[PDB]
Amino acid sequence: PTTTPLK
Ligand SMILES: *[C@H]1O[C@H](CO)[C@H](O)[C@H](O)[C@H]1NC(C)=O
């Protein structure tokens, strides 16, 4: 898995 917030 990979984290990539977007908010
Ligand atoms: C995490 O980053 C990886 C790097 O390519 C992918 O883009 C993947 O889709 C990302 N996961 C999420 C949940 O955005």
Side-chain angles (χ1 to χ4, degrees):
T2 55
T3 63
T4 310
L6 188 66
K7 53 178 270 175

